[PDB]
Amino acid sequence: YPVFAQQNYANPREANGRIVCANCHLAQKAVEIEVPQAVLPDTVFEAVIELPYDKQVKQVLANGKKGDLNVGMVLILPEGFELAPPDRVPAEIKEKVGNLYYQPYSPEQKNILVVGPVPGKKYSEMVVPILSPDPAKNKNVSYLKYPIYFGGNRGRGQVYPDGKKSNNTIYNASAAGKIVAITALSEKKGGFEVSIEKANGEVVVDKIPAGPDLIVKEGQTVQADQPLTNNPNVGGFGQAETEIVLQNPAR
Ligand code: HEC
């Protein structure tokens, strides 16, 4: 979630350009973003983003069942650019923005916006109203061709802030040995217990949450860290970059 980014990363974009959502949303899926080629200072314009995905395909949810995918994103604009305040947003654009609450990444990064989680079915494509700065009143800005970076995600991540795997990812054998037991963990609550008999005779019990399916059977020999399940992830995070020229009005 964007909140996870904000809570554990001071800056969403790293030196090499990767967005930190990618440290947890481990699958890549294209995204798109479009802004006008140029804009006059102190004027509102639109950033149209798209986080496409097959809406017919459901994902593994935290509770183990299957369900809809939700979306979120992080937008990195040049210093001085910001979310346009409502009073500056023309009605027809508000219409297209809909019911979304773009928030600044932090109070000190108003040029960095985020939104999500929100339903992917409804917000697969979003519009963001941006107010351009004015080089005249802001010494940190000039009449340049500026880059804009975007990170769009749809679907649950593979690992939490603590570094533990979510149930929406691949599970692996903790040790090498013979699977002498696969117990349908909990009563209709999902998950399994896979007992691996190590070569020394010790049995360790791997806990598999409900969601991913098993690809191993009783009596099967697995190598250390060998996969015991499929990869249930159907979502993904994508990055796109664009640019806009801050025009120098003239008279
Ligand atoms: C690891 C610390 C994460 C970072 C950094 C980001 N996300 Fe994440 N996200 C993560 C997990 C483990 C999950 C599942 C959480 C749960 O309660 O089950 C999520 C989920 C989302 C969602 C919801 C997706 C859905 O329900 O289909 C969204 C839309 C999402 N994440 C977006 C997102 C964005 C844009 C981020 C970058 C700024 C981001 N996440 C970072 C783990 C982590």
mmCIF file of C-alpha atoms and ligand atoms in Angstrom:
data_model
loop_
_atom_site.group_PDB
_atom_site.id
_atom_site.type_symbol
_atom_site.label_atom_id
_atom_site.label_comp_id
_atom_site.label_asym_id
_atom_site.label_seq_id
_atom_site.Cartn_x
_atom_site.Cartn_y
_atom_site.Cartn_z
ATOM 1 C CA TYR A 1 0.000 0.000 0.000
ATOM 2 C CA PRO A 2 1.142 3.537 -0.510
ATOM 3 C CA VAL A 3 0.865 3.882 3.260
ATOM 4 C CA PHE A 4 3.454 1.106 3.512
ATOM 5 C CA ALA A 5 5.768 3.141 1.257
ATOM 6 C CA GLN A 6 5.283 6.297 3.268
ATOM 7 C CA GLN A 7 5.729 4.508 6.607
ATOM 8 C CA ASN A 8 9.027 2.864 5.694
ATOM 9 C CA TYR A 9 10.603 4.892 2.917
ATOM 10 C CA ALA A 10 11.473 8.585 3.131
ATOM 11 C CA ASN A 11 11.683 8.758 -0.662
ATOM 12 C CA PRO A 12 9.572 6.660 -3.113
ATOM 13 C CA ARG A 13 12.095 6.896 -5.947
ATOM 14 C CA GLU A 14 15.659 5.619 -5.680
ATOM 15 C CA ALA A 15 18.843 6.763 -7.419
ATOM 16 C CA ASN A 16 18.544 4.262 -10.250
ATOM 17 C CA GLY A 17 14.965 5.348 -10.769
ATOM 18 C CA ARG A 18 13.103 2.371 -9.331
ATOM 19 C CA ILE A 19 10.008 3.112 -7.226
ATOM 20 C CA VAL A 20 9.931 1.494 -3.823
ATOM 21 C CA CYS A 21 6.550 -0.219 -4.373
ATOM 22 C CA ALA A 22 8.702 -2.634 -6.394
ATOM 23 C CA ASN A 23 10.408 -3.864 -3.243
ATOM 24 C CA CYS A 24 7.188 -5.610 -2.260
ATOM 25 C CA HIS A 25 5.070 -5.788 -5.429
ATOM 26 C CA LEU A 26 7.542 -8.135 -7.119
ATOM 27 C CA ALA A 27 5.753 -8.690 -10.435
ATOM 28 C CA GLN A 28 5.958 -6.191 -13.280
ATOM 29 C CA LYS A 29 2.895 -4.985 -15.215
ATOM 30 C CA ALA A 30 2.877 -2.043 -17.581
ATOM 31 C CA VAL A 31 1.263 1.235 -16.679
ATOM 32 C CA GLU A 32 0.701 4.376 -18.717
ATOM 33 C CA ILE A 33 0.639 8.067 -17.967
ATOM 34 C CA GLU A 34 -0.140 11.050 -20.107
ATOM 35 C CA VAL A 35 0.205 14.760 -19.405
ATOM 36 C CA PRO A 36 0.104 17.723 -21.821
ATOM 37 C CA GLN A 37 3.388 18.377 -23.651
ATOM 38 C CA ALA A 38 3.493 21.870 -22.246
ATOM 39 C CA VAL A 39 1.796 24.030 -19.642
ATOM 40 C CA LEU A 40 1.724 27.720 -18.723
ATOM 41 C CA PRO A 41 2.777 28.657 -15.189
ATOM 42 C CA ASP A 42 0.231 28.528 -12.356
ATOM 43 C CA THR A 43 -2.320 26.615 -14.429
ATOM 44 C CA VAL A 44 -4.201 23.368 -13.769
ATOM 45 C CA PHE A 45 -3.619 20.406 -16.099
ATOM 46 C CA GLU A 46 -4.375 16.689 -16.104
ATOM 47 C CA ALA A 47 -2.268 13.596 -15.570
ATOM 48 C CA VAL A 48 -4.179 10.595 -16.974
ATOM 49 C CA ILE A 49 -2.820 7.315 -15.675
ATOM 50 C CA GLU A 50 -3.756 3.756 -16.545
ATOM 51 C CA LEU A 51 -3.174 0.549 -14.598
ATOM 52 C CA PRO A 52 -4.579 -2.065 -16.982
ATOM 53 C CA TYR A 53 -5.250 -5.680 -16.007
ATOM 54 C CA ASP A 54 -7.671 -8.497 -16.839
ATOM 55 C CA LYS A 55 -10.586 -7.683 -14.616
ATOM 56 C CA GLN A 56 -11.995 -11.166 -15.029
ATOM 57 C CA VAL A 57 -9.068 -12.719 -13.159
ATOM 58 C CA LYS A 58 -9.373 -12.757 -9.385
ATOM 59 C CA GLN A 59 -6.586 -12.637 -6.842
ATOM 60 C CA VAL A 60 -5.776 -14.385 -3.617
ATOM 61 C CA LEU A 61 -6.908 -12.122 -0.769
ATOM 62 C CA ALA A 62 -5.482 -11.970 2.720
ATOM 63 C CA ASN A 63 -8.288 -14.152 4.079
ATOM 64 C CA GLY A 64 -7.468 -16.864 1.551
ATOM 65 C CA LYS A 65 -10.433 -16.419 -0.730
ATOM 66 C CA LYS A 66 -10.364 -15.008 -4.260
ATOM 67 C CA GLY A 67 -11.462 -11.494 -5.029
ATOM 68 C CA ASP A 68 -11.138 -8.203 -6.839
ATOM 69 C CA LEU A 69 -7.948 -6.293 -7.332
ATOM 70 C CA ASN A 70 -7.432 -2.793 -5.979
ATOM 71 C CA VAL A 71 -5.117 -0.123 -7.273
ATOM 72 C CA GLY A 72 -2.827 2.622 -5.994
ATOM 73 C CA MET A 73 0.054 4.745 -7.237
ATOM 74 C CA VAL A 74 2.830 7.219 -6.515
ATOM 75 C CA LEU A 75 3.406 10.250 -8.768
ATOM 76 C CA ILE A 76 6.653 12.186 -8.634
ATOM 77 C CA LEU A 77 6.349 15.672 -10.105
ATOM 78 C CA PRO A 78 9.069 18.364 -10.310
ATOM 79 C CA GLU A 79 9.630 20.606 -7.293
ATOM 80 C CA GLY A 80 6.909 23.251 -7.220
ATOM 81 C CA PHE A 81 4.204 21.195 -8.931
ATOM 82 C CA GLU A 82 1.338 20.153 -6.698
ATOM 83 C CA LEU A 83 -2.149 18.739 -6.531
ATOM 84 C CA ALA A 84 -4.520 21.506 -7.650
ATOM 85 C CA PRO A 85 -6.756 22.661 -4.827
ATOM 86 C CA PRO A 86 -10.507 22.128 -5.409
ATOM 87 C CA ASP A 87 -11.214 25.799 -5.943
ATOM 88 C CA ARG A 88 -8.761 25.767 -8.917
ATOM 89 C CA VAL A 89 -10.218 22.575 -10.394
ATOM 90 C CA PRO A 90 -12.809 23.141 -13.146
ATOM 91 C CA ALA A 91 -16.001 21.143 -12.654
ATOM 92 C CA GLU A 92 -15.507 19.084 -15.795
ATOM 93 C CA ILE A 93 -12.164 17.888 -14.501
ATOM 94 C CA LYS A 94 -13.520 17.214 -11.028
ATOM 95 C CA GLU A 95 -16.085 15.079 -12.812
ATOM 96 C CA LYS A 96 -13.311 13.014 -14.422
ATOM 97 C CA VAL A 97 -11.335 12.802 -11.161
ATOM 98 C CA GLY A 98 -14.271 11.348 -9.349
ATOM 99 C CA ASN A 99 -14.174 10.436 -5.715
ATOM 100 C CA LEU A 100 -10.457 10.128 -5.084
ATOM 101 C CA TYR A 101 -8.297 11.528 -2.346
ATOM 102 C CA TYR A 102 -4.850 12.302 -3.623
ATOM 103 C CA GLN A 103 -2.517 12.888 -0.658
ATOM 104 C CA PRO A 104 1.008 14.282 -0.641
ATOM 105 C CA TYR A 105 3.642 11.648 0.159
ATOM 106 C CA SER A 106 4.504 13.636 3.249
ATOM 107 C CA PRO A 107 3.905 17.227 4.223
ATOM 108 C CA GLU A 108 7.382 18.122 2.942
ATOM 109 C CA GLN A 109 6.853 16.454 -0.447
ATOM 110 C CA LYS A 110 3.785 18.135 -1.917
ATOM 111 C CA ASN A 111 5.164 17.465 -5.381
ATOM 112 C CA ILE A 112 4.752 13.728 -4.620
ATOM 113 C CA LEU A 113 1.190 12.354 -4.675
ATOM 114 C CA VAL A 114 -0.392 9.014 -3.901
ATOM 115 C CA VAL A 115 -3.799 7.390 -3.934
ATOM 116 C CA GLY A 116 -4.969 3.931 -3.051
ATOM 117 C CA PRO A 117 -6.058 1.411 -2.194
ATOM 118 C CA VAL A 118 -9.200 1.969 -4.311
ATOM 119 C CA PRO A 119 -11.125 -0.550 -6.464
ATOM 120 C CA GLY A 120 -9.348 -1.487 -9.657
ATOM 121 C CA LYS A 121 -12.628 -2.092 -11.447
ATOM 122 C CA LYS A 122 -13.574 1.547 -11.026
ATOM 123 C CA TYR A 123 -10.168 3.228 -10.907
ATOM 124 C CA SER A 124 -8.163 1.292 -13.446
ATOM 125 C CA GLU A 125 -7.731 4.674 -15.165
ATOM 126 C CA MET A 126 -7.449 7.861 -13.056
ATOM 127 C CA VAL A 127 -7.106 11.598 -13.638
ATOM 128 C CA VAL A 128 -4.987 13.774 -11.363
ATOM 129 C CA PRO A 129 -5.468 17.559 -11.367
ATOM 130 C CA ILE A 130 -2.058 19.229 -11.095
ATOM 131 C CA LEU A 131 -1.238 22.901 -10.526
ATOM 132 C CA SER A 132 1.938 24.031 -12.277
ATOM 133 C CA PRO A 133 4.334 26.340 -10.377
ATOM 134 C CA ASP A 134 5.648 29.725 -11.527
ATOM 135 C CA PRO A 135 9.398 30.241 -12.031
ATOM 136 C CA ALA A 136 8.680 33.905 -11.381
ATOM 137 C CA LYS A 137 7.591 33.261 -7.780
ATOM 138 C CA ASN A 138 9.526 30.061 -7.198
ATOM 139 C CA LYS A 139 13.317 30.247 -7.514
ATOM 140 C CA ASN A 140 13.441 26.438 -7.502
ATOM 141 C CA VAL A 141 11.739 26.296 -10.909
ATOM 142 C CA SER A 142 12.565 27.263 -14.477
ATOM 143 C CA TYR A 143 11.003 27.152 -17.961
ATOM 144 C CA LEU A 144 12.382 23.661 -18.606
ATOM 145 C CA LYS A 145 11.271 20.312 -20.040
ATOM 146 C CA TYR A 146 10.746 18.443 -16.806
ATOM 147 C CA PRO A 147 10.484 14.659 -16.224
ATOM 148 C CA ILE A 148 7.582 13.089 -14.356
ATOM 149 C CA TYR A 149 7.827 9.626 -12.817
ATOM 150 C CA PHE A 150 4.911 7.297 -12.125
ATOM 151 C CA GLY A 151 4.414 4.026 -10.285
ATOM 152 C CA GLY A 152 1.187 2.137 -10.615
ATOM 153 C CA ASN A 153 0.161 -0.968 -8.777
ATOM 154 C CA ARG A 154 -2.728 -3.343 -8.872
ATOM 155 C CA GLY A 155 -2.985 -6.384 -6.631
ATOM 156 C CA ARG A 156 -1.667 -7.510 -3.276
ATOM 157 C CA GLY A 157 2.047 -7.556 -2.510
ATOM 158 C CA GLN A 158 4.372 -10.481 -1.860
ATOM 159 C CA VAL A 159 6.015 -9.288 1.355
ATOM 160 C CA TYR A 160 5.145 -7.076 4.326
ATOM 161 C CA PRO A 161 7.114 -4.189 5.939
ATOM 162 C CA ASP A 162 8.676 -6.657 8.406
ATOM 163 C CA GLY A 163 10.047 -8.753 5.546
ATOM 164 C CA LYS A 164 7.654 -11.662 6.010
ATOM 165 C CA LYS A 165 5.988 -13.220 2.987
ATOM 166 C CA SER A 166 2.334 -12.494 2.327
ATOM 167 C CA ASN A 167 0.173 -15.438 1.230
ATOM 168 C CA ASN A 168 0.132 -14.049 -2.263
ATOM 169 C CA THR A 169 3.444 -15.526 -3.277
ATOM 170 C CA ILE A 170 5.475 -18.730 -3.727
ATOM 171 C CA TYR A 171 6.199 -20.901 -0.693
ATOM 172 C CA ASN A 172 9.406 -22.985 -0.382
ATOM 173 C CA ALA A 173 10.638 -25.987 1.599
ATOM 174 C CA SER A 174 12.562 -24.890 4.709
ATOM 175 C CA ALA A 175 14.797 -27.947 4.472
ATOM 176 C CA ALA A 176 15.675 -30.803 2.183
ATOM 177 C CA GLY A 177 13.953 -34.098 2.899
ATOM 178 C CA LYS A 178 11.056 -36.422 2.267
ATOM 179 C CA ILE A 179 7.553 -35.048 2.556
ATOM 180 C CA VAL A 180 6.002 -37.633 4.861
ATOM 181 C CA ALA A 181 2.908 -35.567 5.518
ATOM 182 C CA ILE A 182 0.630 -32.888 4.081
ATOM 183 C CA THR A 183 -2.157 -31.940 6.462
ATOM 184 C CA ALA A 184 -5.034 -29.763 5.316
ATOM 185 C CA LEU A 185 -4.332 -27.107 7.956
ATOM 186 C CA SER A 186 -7.316 -25.834 9.949
ATOM 187 C CA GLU A 187 -10.942 -26.787 9.414
ATOM 188 C CA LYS A 188 -12.108 -25.143 6.203
ATOM 189 C CA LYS A 189 -9.782 -22.269 7.139
ATOM 190 C CA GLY A 190 -7.171 -23.205 4.564
ATOM 191 C CA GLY A 191 -3.451 -23.715 4.519
ATOM 192 C CA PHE A 192 -1.476 -26.859 4.902
ATOM 193 C CA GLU A 193 1.179 -28.324 7.084
ATOM 194 C CA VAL A 194 3.923 -29.994 5.150
ATOM 195 C CA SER A 195 6.088 -32.236 7.275
ATOM 196 C CA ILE A 196 9.535 -32.703 5.805
ATOM 197 C CA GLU A 197 11.551 -35.620 7.139
ATOM 198 C CA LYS A 198 15.199 -34.444 7.024
ATOM 199 C CA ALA A 199 17.977 -36.884 6.129
ATOM 200 C CA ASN A 200 18.978 -37.066 9.804
ATOM 201 C CA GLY A 201 15.450 -38.175 10.686
ATOM 202 C CA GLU A 202 14.261 -34.850 12.068
ATOM 203 C CA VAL A 203 10.898 -33.635 10.822
ATOM 204 C CA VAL A 204 10.251 -29.900 10.423
ATOM 205 C CA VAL A 205 6.749 -28.587 9.725
ATOM 206 C CA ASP A 206 6.276 -25.974 7.025
ATOM 207 C CA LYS A 207 3.191 -23.813 7.436
ATOM 208 C CA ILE A 208 1.534 -22.870 4.143
ATOM 209 C CA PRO A 209 -1.213 -20.270 4.296
ATOM 210 C CA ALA A 210 -4.425 -20.652 2.401
ATOM 211 C CA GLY A 211 -4.340 -19.062 -1.078
ATOM 212 C CA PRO A 212 -1.468 -20.594 -3.018
ATOM 213 C CA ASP A 213 -1.905 -24.187 -4.265
ATOM 214 C CA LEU A 214 0.460 -27.016 -3.507
ATOM 215 C CA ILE A 215 2.510 -28.599 -6.270
ATOM 216 C CA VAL A 216 4.015 -31.329 -4.098
ATOM 217 C CA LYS A 217 2.620 -34.635 -2.849
ATOM 218 C CA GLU A 218 3.173 -37.009 0.043
ATOM 219 C CA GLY A 219 6.204 -39.179 -0.570
ATOM 220 C CA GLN A 220 7.917 -36.557 -2.700
ATOM 221 C CA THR A 221 11.515 -35.543 -2.088
ATOM 222 C CA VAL A 222 12.245 -31.785 -2.227
ATOM 223 C CA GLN A 223 15.480 -29.792 -2.150
ATOM 224 C CA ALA A 224 16.143 -27.009 0.313
ATOM 225 C CA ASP A 225 14.117 -23.930 -0.678
ATOM 226 C CA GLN A 226 12.519 -25.858 -3.524
ATOM 227 C CA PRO A 227 9.018 -24.549 -4.308
ATOM 228 C CA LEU A 228 6.093 -26.344 -2.596
ATOM 229 C CA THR A 229 3.478 -24.150 -4.220
ATOM 230 C CA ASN A 230 2.571 -22.249 -7.355
ATOM 231 C CA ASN A 231 2.886 -18.465 -7.647
ATOM 232 C CA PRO A 232 -0.687 -17.157 -7.075
ATOM 233 C CA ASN A 233 0.131 -13.490 -7.823
ATOM 234 C CA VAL A 234 -1.979 -12.134 -10.664
ATOM 235 C CA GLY A 235 -1.319 -8.436 -10.127
ATOM 236 C CA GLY A 236 1.707 -6.240 -10.534
ATOM 237 C CA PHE A 237 3.464 -2.940 -10.306
ATOM 238 C CA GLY A 238 4.578 -0.864 -13.259
ATOM 239 C CA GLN A 239 6.582 2.308 -13.876
ATOM 240 C CA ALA A 240 6.376 4.876 -16.645
ATOM 241 C CA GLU A 241 8.070 8.187 -17.171
ATOM 242 C CA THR A 242 7.001 11.227 -19.136
ATOM 243 C CA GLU A 243 7.781 14.933 -19.419
ATOM 244 C CA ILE A 244 6.170 18.341 -19.665
ATOM 245 C CA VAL A 245 7.519 21.754 -20.615
ATOM 246 C CA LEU A 246 6.884 24.656 -18.275
ATOM 247 C CA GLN A 247 6.106 27.439 -20.708
ATOM 248 C CA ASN A 248 7.431 30.962 -20.441
ATOM 249 C CA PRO A 249 4.410 33.169 -21.247
ATOM 250 C CA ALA A 250 5.493 36.234 -23.223
ATOM 251 C CA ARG A 251 4.370 39.833 -23.825
HETATM 252 C C1 HEC B 1 6.115 -3.590 1.245
HETATM 253 C C2 HEC B 1 6.579 -2.988 2.597
HETATM 254 C C3 HEC B 1 5.198 -2.815 0.475
HETATM 255 C C4 HEC B 1 5.434 -1.595 -0.116
HETATM 256 C C5 HEC B 1 6.686 -0.678 0.023
HETATM 257 C C6 HEC B 1 4.236 -1.295 -0.886
HETATM 258 N N1 HEC B 1 3.286 -2.246 -0.742
HETATM 259 FE FE1 HEC B 1 1.517 -2.284 -1.551
HETATM 260 N N2 HEC B 1 1.051 -3.900 -0.578
HETATM 261 C C7 HEC B 1 1.925 -4.718 0.117
HETATM 262 C C8 HEC B 1 1.246 -5.917 0.561
HETATM 263 C C9 HEC B 1 1.871 -7.037 1.392
HETATM 264 C C10 HEC B 1 -0.053 -5.826 0.210
HETATM 265 C C11 HEC B 1 -1.179 -6.750 0.743
HETATM 266 C C12 HEC B 1 -1.667 -6.120 2.019
HETATM 267 C C13 HEC B 1 -2.895 -6.796 2.615
HETATM 268 O O1 HEC B 1 -3.520 -6.180 3.513
HETATM 269 O O2 HEC B 1 -3.230 -7.930 2.200
HETATM 270 C C14 HEC B 1 -0.149 -4.550 -0.492
HETATM 271 C C15 HEC B 1 -1.226 -4.102 -1.069
HETATM 272 C C16 HEC B 1 -1.348 -3.038 -1.920
HETATM 273 C C17 HEC B 1 -2.612 -2.573 -2.484
HETATM 274 C C18 HEC B 1 -3.971 -3.306 -2.388
HETATM 275 C C19 HEC B 1 -3.990 -4.229 -3.615
HETATM 276 C C20 HEC B 1 -5.219 -5.144 -3.683
HETATM 277 O O3 HEC B 1 -5.934 -5.296 -2.675
HETATM 278 O O4 HEC B 1 -5.464 -5.729 -4.758
HETATM 279 C C21 HEC B 1 -2.262 -1.558 -3.334
HETATM 280 C C22 HEC B 1 -3.179 -0.871 -4.346
HETATM 281 C C23 HEC B 1 -0.843 -1.380 -3.222
HETATM 282 N N3 HEC B 1 -0.290 -2.260 -2.323
HETATM 283 C C24 HEC B 1 -0.145 -0.344 -3.802
HETATM 284 C C25 HEC B 1 1.162 -0.011 -3.490
HETATM 285 C C26 HEC B 1 1.852 1.148 -4.057
HETATM 286 C C27 HEC B 1 1.432 2.104 -5.193
HETATM 287 C C28 HEC B 1 2.996 1.212 -3.467
HETATM 288 C C29 HEC B 1 4.036 2.074 -3.856
HETATM 289 C C30 HEC B 1 3.984 3.510 -3.435
HETATM 290 C C31 HEC B 1 3.022 0.098 -2.490
HETATM 291 N N4 HEC B 1 1.911 -0.655 -2.546
HETATM 292 C C32 HEC B 1 4.103 -0.185 -1.681
HETATM 293 C C33 HEC B 1 3.218 -4.386 0.417
HETATM 294 C C34 HEC B 1 3.852 -3.187 0.076
#
